Amino acid sequence: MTMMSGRPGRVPLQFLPNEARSLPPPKLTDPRLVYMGFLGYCSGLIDNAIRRRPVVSAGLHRQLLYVTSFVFFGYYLLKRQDYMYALRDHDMFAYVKSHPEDFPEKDKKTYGEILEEFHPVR
Amino acid sequence: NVLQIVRDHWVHILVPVGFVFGCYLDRRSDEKLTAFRNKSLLFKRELRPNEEVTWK
Amino acid sequence: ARQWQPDVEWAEQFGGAVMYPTKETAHWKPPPWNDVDPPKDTLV
Amino acid sequence: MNPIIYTTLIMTVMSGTMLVMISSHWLLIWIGFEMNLLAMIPVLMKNFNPRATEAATKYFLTQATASMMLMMAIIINLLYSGQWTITKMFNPVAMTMMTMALAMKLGLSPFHFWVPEVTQGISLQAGLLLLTWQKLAPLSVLCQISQSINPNLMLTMAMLSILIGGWGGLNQTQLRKIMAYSSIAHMGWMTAVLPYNTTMTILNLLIYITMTLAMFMLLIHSSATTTLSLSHTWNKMPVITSLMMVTLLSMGGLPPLSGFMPKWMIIQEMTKNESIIMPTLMAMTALLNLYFYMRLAYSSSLTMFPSTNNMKMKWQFEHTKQMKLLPTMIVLSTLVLPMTPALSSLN
Amino acid sequence: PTIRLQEDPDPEDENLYEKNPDSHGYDKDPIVDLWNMRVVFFFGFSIVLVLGSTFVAYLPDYRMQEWARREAERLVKYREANGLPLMESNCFDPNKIQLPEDED
Amino acid sequence: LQYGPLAFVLGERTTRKLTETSKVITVDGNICSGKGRLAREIAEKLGLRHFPEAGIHYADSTTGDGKPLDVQLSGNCSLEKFYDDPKSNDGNSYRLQSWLYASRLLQYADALEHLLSTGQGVVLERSIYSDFVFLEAMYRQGFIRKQCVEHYNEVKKVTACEYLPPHVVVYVDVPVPEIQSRIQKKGNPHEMKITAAYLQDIENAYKKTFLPEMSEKCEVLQYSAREAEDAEKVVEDIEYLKCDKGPWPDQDDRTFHRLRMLVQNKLEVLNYTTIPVYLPEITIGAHQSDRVFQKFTELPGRKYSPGYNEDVGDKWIWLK
Amino acid sequence: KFYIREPPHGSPDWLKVGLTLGTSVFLWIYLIKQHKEDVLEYKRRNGLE
Amino acid sequence: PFFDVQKRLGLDLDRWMTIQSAEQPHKIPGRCHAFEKEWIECAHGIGGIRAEK
Amino acid sequence: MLKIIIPTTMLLPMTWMSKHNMIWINATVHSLLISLISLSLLNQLGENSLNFSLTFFSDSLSAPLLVLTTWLLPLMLMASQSHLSKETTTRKKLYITMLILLQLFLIMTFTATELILFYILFEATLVPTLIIITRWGNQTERLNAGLYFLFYTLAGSLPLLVALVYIQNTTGSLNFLIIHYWSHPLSNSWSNIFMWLACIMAFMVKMPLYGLHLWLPKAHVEAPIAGSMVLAAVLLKLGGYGMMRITTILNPLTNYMAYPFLMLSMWGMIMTSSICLRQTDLKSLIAYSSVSHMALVIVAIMIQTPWSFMGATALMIAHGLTSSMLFCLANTNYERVHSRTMILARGLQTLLPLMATWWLVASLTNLALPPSINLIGELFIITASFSWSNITIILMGMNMMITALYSLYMLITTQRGKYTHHINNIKPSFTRENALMALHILPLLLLTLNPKMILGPL
Amino acid sequence: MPLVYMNIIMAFAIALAGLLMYRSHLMSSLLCLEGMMLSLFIMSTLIILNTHFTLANMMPIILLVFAACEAALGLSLLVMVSNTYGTDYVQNLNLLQC
Ligand SMILES: CCCCCCCCCCCCCCCCCC(=O)OC[C@H](COP(=O)([O-])OCC(O)COP(=O)([O-])OC[C@@H](COC(=O)CCCCCCCCCCCCCCCCC)OC(=O)CCCCCCCCCCCCCCCCC)OC(=O)CCCCCCCCCCCCCCCCC
Ligand SMILES: CCCCCCCCCCCCCCCCC[C@@H](O)O[C@H](CO[C@H](O)CCCCCCCCCCCCCCC)COP(=O)(O)OCC[N+](C)(C)C
Ligand SMILES: CCCCCCCCCCCCCCCCC[C@@H](O)O[C@H](CO[C@H](O)CCCCCCCCCCCCCCC)COP(=O)(O)OCC[N+](C)(C)C
Ligand SMILES: CCCCCCCCCCCCCCCCC[C@@H](O)O[C@H](CO[C@H](O)CCCCCCCCCCCCCCC)COP(=O)(O)OCC[N+](C)(C)C
Ligand SMILES: Nc1ncnc2c1ncn2[C@@H]1O[C@H](COP(=O)(O)OP(=O)(O)O)[C@@H](O)[C@H]1O
């Protein structure tokens, strides 16, 4: 099953609709971005190790490019993910609003009027 | 001469620095859960003539 | 005095064409070191 | 083979897959499959020897039968509804034939026998291509026609694929056949969740492709095709064996590694429907794949096997060709679980 | 060769007391050995053990044992003064409870 | 730029650099014969690069610095103790033979790479096609087992089939008594123990297997002891050979491209020398392997890649 | 010390190093600018400031 | 799965041959042109699930 | 509680950046400092837990477990550096990295607020343990041990995962506070029975339950000393902690689903105590001891009373300390004589008096001499079982008789009698080993001085 | 459906069964593949002619083209197999197992 492929108004290969510009962008200190940079740093260290170079000191420009590329991709990935979750919430709330018969708010009962069975432990 | 001493024993600040950073991050996390500060039925209180918040 | 490590007898368990050999597959041979079977003399 | 001709053939393979992925007409999808197969046959025969020829012949026979069944299903669908657009597949007999043809193309059980043989008969680069790129087109078609699928048939084939992959992989000492049985089990996992959520299918496919690329690239870096030849790598380059061990653990699905993420997600999706027994069976069966991965890790990284004298000479030389994407592939194969919610971007 | 493989012989175990009669069993380097002993003894016994025990012994009463004792004292005094029972079998007021209408 | 598919696609072709004097030459002969001097003279006269015979430490001379390493970390075999105790129960004989075959394979790959890269010819003393004679002389004397011969044949079968045999094979024939006289006049106390049966076995292997089978690939130039000092006559005999019968004329750009990709990447050259066949003579236990590898990695210029060893004076590492 | 050329010499490949550093710096500047414009557009659309 | 390259670029690579009611040469009509036209106009824009009923 | 998590993650690069001959010193010093910091978690409330954030919380049940983990890391480091002297620097750093990663996973496991995060960390603890066992174990059986350790665990935990996600589709949350406040009874249906089994069996195999315990002697005998320490002291308590967490949603089904497990626990406690009487390997005896004590803990958790829960908490802490000390004591003799056979080296009191005193104190705490916290936990569990049924005092009573026997048996075999004549390589005890024994034993008696810190939230 | 449609479908099924059941010659199986292609051509042509789908009239020709490609591919492989064994028997393709 595909939930969102046929959602009306969806541009085939956009990756970032204009509506997404109404959402707050992720901060540059977002922990997910920090973890993506950490993944880039680990990639650089593994690159040094495989090539039989000093792991921590061999190429600083290469490691910098690794970290920068991972952060650069992660920013847009996070933007798209947040947009998709916002879309899901928007559609859910609109559907609940447009079908009140399927989502009734029934009368509230307090615990002084609800009979719950008691199971003793012995 | 402190160059050799530093380059031999600079690994001894990593764990204290991590402790301080963890304390700072815990304070930051506490900063995001103030939705009921001075609002519970048990602890709701009138503010003093000076203090701004009941806890940080 | 030292940690045990695999020897030749241990390593030969994985050198066959198959694990858990049976009577049928005991005659299966491992592939050649390079994947080149010797050429047959199928003279025409 | 000329490098120009090899590049042209690889581009034609990719073009056939892309034509399958972008087409709206059933005839163009079938043409994409034909072009992909026609360009793929010589790539499997690049290093000429009898085993490669046998593998190419078996692959051609399987894929040609699958394409004939595909075309017959298309024609039956046209007969009962004059439609060429890839859609809800208005006829059930045609849909059954279509499902069987796509399963035969993918190598799902019980049309699984050709995968270990073709993988063993070709080189490691050809095996990488066959087990990574060749899954995209049939899975794309199956995702497009998922709403008309019969869940009983696909779930039966997926469970059979998982079981057969585990059992067959338990018996192997050749690394290519191990990879082929692992591929069969992972295809079973991919197709088990397809009638419920195609995003989970895409996520599983991406993670499997990343792990398989890392595995094959590590196997090419250390020129090993058997367990015993891989047991020498520790005495030449231990870093490669350690990275291989972690990658094998990830392929086994252990938390907190990335290979745990798809199964987890798939299991959750299956419990959003009722579907309780099948996910439990699937996990308990994936334990077999974990077992033979662990046996490989025992042979190559966690213990030290005896070596040979001539290995000393190999100590004096370095690897000439370097794979630029291997470190990123390893990192994505291992440390990606904390970014799980990003899967929302897949739908 | 009547052998199976070329292997190093299993070596004898080294006694740390031979090269260092007062060796503490931490390292073969005498200075590193001595300082390992010193740091283990200072940070294990002097810091964590004694100071941690003192810190735990004087932990403030967040379990509210003394508060509960004082509250119980006030309650007992009041109830004994007014002649009420010390404790009630009901911990919730029945006027705030609505039983089901029919039991038949 | 490193040679590869990209270099072949645009420009670079091997067939144009061949200028009628490529002519891979090998100069075989028995022990203590003057084949090395003849090879040096041939190389000097024809302007080709001379490769001295590959010894135990041939690989050492081409990696790191050209200085040899300790016998424990390279070779792990001795020719002197092979002469002293050829029937030693520690496997020295076949270990030495296998290491020497691997060294010869490496040298042949180096020579082929040089010839295909520059178009200049090469002159070798012995080759992978000629090493087997010593192995035969080892087996007929009882110095090695039959399983060692089987392993050697397997390795040769999977290795020597990927290269081109030499254009012209030059042989120097010296009788066994003359060889014994030369050895006695030499003075090396380890070579005086060479029995005449060993030399006769080497000569029999040569004259009954190597020359007959090499004569089918190309014509063989045999010279006696007296007509090998006159090197100019040998050279002018080489200069008038009709070389159009072997596999060398059956080579085009794509086969040369494949061979050139193979001759570089010495790891791919040596791939099949360490096949997991567990002969006691060449199998090394895990503990010894670990100790010896740790010892090797601690050599002054060996821990990292060639340009990344700051303990031998490598600068600007943190930008490389 | 090395018997062979070791094509990577004592000095680093300046062209590659410059290209790598320039790519990293350009990507960082582009990311900063894009984040600034994104914040501005979000504030404008939602009318915070 | 399906990358709608044709829709994104407006290319019409193969849509001209998907249905029988779409611009035949010389305006030759299919045997069931009207029925297909009516079904397509009924089912347009409401999705497969609703169109099936 | 990032003030504890971040310093361990900093231990990682501090170890990997240290000078080759300073790794042990730095690791030990900063591990002890982290333990001192974690000591502050013992300040607990009487009503609710310390809810640090949306992700981590501390209860009166998990705080002593965290303190035990952080205290066990330096002891493991001290015990490991003797037999790893010949190792290369990189492999020593890798071993220390495995230990640090295990500590991090355990710390995050004991404080996770959600059940799926708890599951992920509680499975993540598997990898470092398996690597340690199969890479640094001494004998060829370690490989088999590793396999037994892995699948026995996973065959229990894979069903649990399914159940967990199923629960989240039914109630909407796996947060433990929400789960506790919004608790609803479990009806008596086959579906509920299988949900109960899926929720219970993973923790049962972790304890381990008698009949599912075969992995433990193998894994705890074949492991290196630090592996055995962390397996006996902390990793067995994951099952008990998880069971006490998960039982809040299983009532009133437990009322009758506990019978087979209660019978297995009591009878198998008798059985494993009896097995300890005829054991030729000294490490296997300690492993079977752990099995018996954990059977007691299982009974306490299954009967579901406040006294049983307090006893279970106290017993887990006390057993962790005592079993780790016993494993270290056996390892000293093994390093001296290179054999695990108990009757090989005898009369060791004549040669090593202070080590004999350590042996006596460890065996005294094993048999639960009053007023040790071992005895406090055992007595609380026995009293709760007596309330559950008066006949239990029979089986429990028999256990108390057998335990002491085998405990003293062990002592009498190793320390008393006459020394073996041909063993002439028994060197005097090092300062490191005596310090290790003291750092094990002194916290036990200090905790006896203030027992409410290990009695749990009840 | 008319009887002719059932006959063409039966022909396709027969050709598929013939392909799936090998005797000895690879050439016979290739012939069965060609027969399946021919049956598909006939069936599609009959459907397209019956419904007067004008633009679909080019579809069968396209089918034939790729049939030829498939036919060529098979023949090429057969040549190599024969050159290895002196025969085209499927029994000889047994170097690789499961
Ligand atoms: C969860 C929380 C967060 C955790 C994150 C996840 C874990 C960490 C990240 C993982 C990736 C990072 C490292 C990747 C590259 C490492 C590859 C490597 O070989 O390392 C060698 C390298 C040493 O090499 P060298 O210095 O050139 O000289 C020694 C020779 O090379 C001698 O080398 P050799 O090759 O000759 O030696 C042979 C050796 C070589 O083999 C290895 O070294 C194994 C390395 C494998 C890499 C890991 C695989 C891929 C990552 C997946 C990890 C999964 C984690 C999840 C849990 C599951 C565990 C598997 O092989 C063996 O000896 C066989 C041993 C068999 C044991 C098998 C166990 C292997 C798997 C264990 C993995 C555990 C995680 C990583 C451990 C740390 C590794 C350094 O190690 C390092 O020094 C690098 C690590 C430290 C750098 C980071 C420090 C940052 C800067 C300091 C300041 C900190 C800033 C803080 C901010 C505040 C300001 C004050
Ligand atoms: C194991 C780790 C997995 C990593 C996989 C590779 C990661 C690197 C690849 C980078 C992707 C490049 C894409 C960016 C260019 C823009 C292309 C854009 O136009 O495509 C959009 C599509 O967007 C992409 O799908 C998003 C790609 C991002 C994938 C990452 C999710 C992985 C799951 C979470 C694991 C953590 C990942 C960490 C990253 C380092 C169009 O959507 P649409 O045409 O309508 O979809 C067609 C298919 N449908 C309709 C059936 C759905
Ligand atoms: C070698 C020679 C040995 C023999 C010679 C010894 C000489 C004499 C020394 C022996 C002293 C005898 C002990 C007698 C007890 C006196 C001290 C006692 O009174 O203090 C207790 C206090 O003890 C501490 O509370 C217990 C210590 C805490 C234990 C934590 C250990 C540190 C952590 C180490 C690692 C953790 C590993 C275990 C994980 C769970 C009482 O607490 P409390 O009744 O309230 O006090 C009420 C008043 N307050 C509250 C205001 C203070
Ligand atoms: C080696 C140690 C491994 C770990 C040990 C795990 C222990 C698991 C044991 C499970 C305990 C009980 C499970 C289910 C509770 C009752 C079981 C049954 O015997 O009781 C009767 C059940 O009646 C009959 O016995 C029907 C069940 C018979 C079929 C079950 C197969 C048991 C045979 C033994 C197979 C061994 C299983 C373990 C394999 C290792 C009760 O009658 P009834 O009131 O109607 O059923 C209650 C449920 N209702 C209310 C929904 C209807
Ligand atoms: N494959 C081999 N096996 C054993 N010994 C060899 C081998 N190749 C060369 N040698 C030894 O090298 C020594 C001298 O080599 P040779 O080329 O024959 O003499 P020269 O140095 O005068 O040219 C001889 O003692 C010979 O035994």
From TrEMBL, chain A:
Q: Extract the signal peptide range.
A: none
Source superkingdom: Eukaryota
Q: Which UniProt keywords apply?
A: Electron transport, Membrane, Mitochondrion, Mitochondrion inner membrane, Respiratory chain, Transmembrane, Transmembrane helix, Transport, Ubiquinone
**Its membrane topology:** Single-pass membrane protein
Q: Is the Transport keyword given for this protein?
A: yes
Q: Where in the cell is it found?
A: Mitochondrion inner membrane
What Pfam families does the database record attribute to this sequence?
A: NDUF_C2 (PF06374)
Q: Does the keyword Isomerase apply?
A: no
Question: Could you state one GO cellular component term attached to this entry?
Answer: respiratory chain complex I
Please list every transmembrane segment annotated in the UniProt record, as residue ranges: 62-78
Picking any one GO biological process from the record gives:
mitochondrial respiratory chain complex I assembly
Family membership noted in the UniProt record = Belongs to the complex I NDUFC2 subunit family.
Its biological purpose? Accessory subunit of the mitochondrial membrane respiratory chain NADH dehydrogenase (Complex I), that is believed not to be involved in catalysis. Complex I functions in the transfer of electrons from NADH to the respiratory chain. The immediate electron acceptor for the enzyme is believed to be ubiquinone.
Report the PANTHER family cross-referenced here.
Answer: NADH DEHYDROGENASE [UBIQUINONE] 1 SUBUNIT C2-RELATED (PTHR13099:SF0), NADH-UBIQUINONE OXIDOREDUCTASE SUBUNIT B14.5B (PTHR13099)
Q: What is this protein called?
A: NADH dehydrogenase [ubiquinone] 1 subunit C2
Taxonomic source organism: Sus scrofa
- Taxonomic classification, please? Eukaryota, Metazoa, Chordata, Craniata, Vertebrata
Automatic annotation (TrEMBL), chain G:
Decide whether keyword Transmembrane is in the record.
Answer: yes
Q: Does the keyword Calcium apply?
A: no
Which keywords accompany this UniProt record? Answer: Electron transport, Membrane, Mitochondrion, Mitochondrion inner membrane, Respiratory chain, Transit peptide, Transmembrane, Transmembrane helix, Transport
Where in the cell is the protein located?
Answer: Mitochondrion inner membrane
Coiled-coil segments on the chain, per record: none
- Principal localization? mitochondrion
Gene Ontology terms: cellular component: mitochondrial inner membrane; respiratory chain complex I
Instruction: Classify the protein's membrane topology as the record does.
Output: Single-pass membrane protein
Summary of subunit composition and partner proteins: Complex I is composed of 45 different subunits.
Q: What is the documented function of this protein?
A: Accessory subunit of the mitochondrial membrane respiratory chain NADH dehydrogenase (Complex I), that is believed not to be involved in catalysis. Complex I functions in the transfer of electrons from NADH to the respiratory chain. The immediate electron acceptor for the enzyme is believed to be ubiquinone.
**Family, as annotated:** Belongs to the complex I NDUFC1 subunit family.
Name of this chain's protein:
NADH dehydrogenase [ubiquinone] 1 subunit C1, mitochondrial
* The gene coding this protein: NDUFC1
Summarize which stretch of the complete protein this chain spans. Answer: 28 to 76 of 76
From TrEMBL, chain H:
Q: How does it sit in the membrane?
A: Peripheral membrane protein
Q: Which UniProt keywords apply?
A: Disulfide bond, Electron transport, Membrane, Mitochondrion, Mitochondrion inner membrane, Respiratory chain, Transport
Give compartment(s). Mitochondrion inner membrane; Mitochondrion intermembrane space
- Gene Ontology BP terms: mitochondrial respiratory chain complex I assembly
Question: Superkingdom, according to UniProt?
Answer: Eukaryota
Query: What are the record's GO terms for cellular component?
Result: mitochondrial inner membrane; mitochondrial intermembrane space; respiratory chain complex I
Instruction: Tell me how this protein assembles.
Output: Mammalian complex I is composed of 45 different subunits. This is a component of the iron-sulfur (IP) fragment of the enzyme.
Entry function: Accessory subunit of the mitochondrial membrane respiratory chain NADH dehydrogenase (Complex I), that is believed not to be involved in catalysis. Complex I functions in the transfer of electrons from NADH to the respiratory chain. The immediate electron acceptor for the enzyme is believed to be ubiquinone.
Q: Which family does it belong to?
A: Belongs to the complex I NDUFS5 subunit family.
State the name under which the record lists this protein.
Answer: NADH dehydrogenase [ubiquinone] iron-sulfur protein 5
- In the complete protein, the residues contained here run 2 to 54 of 106
UniProtKB/TrEMBL annotation, chain I:
What is the catalytic activity of this protein? a ubiquinone + NADH + 5 H(+)(in) = a ubiquinol + NAD(+) + 4 H(+)(out)
TM region positions: 21-41, 61-80, 92-110, 116-133, 145-167, 193-216, 223-244, 256-277, 284-303, 309-330, 351-369, 389-412, 433-449
As for membrane topology, the entry says:
Multi-pass membrane protein
* Record keywords: Electron transport, Membrane, Mitochondrion, NAD, Respiratory chain, Translocase, Transmembrane, Transmembrane helix, Transport, Ubiquinone
| Predominant location category | mitochondrion
Q: What is its EC number?
A: 7.1.1.2
Role summary:
Core subunit of the mitochondrial membrane respiratory chain NADH dehydrogenase (Complex I) which catalyzes electron transfer from NADH through the respiratory chain, using ubiquinone as an electron acceptor. Essential for the catalytic activity and assembly of complex I.
Q: Subunit comment for this entry?
A: Core subunit of respiratory chain NADH dehydrogenase (Complex I) which is composed of 45 different subunits.
Q: By what name is this protein known?
A: NADH-ubiquinone oxidoreductase chain 4
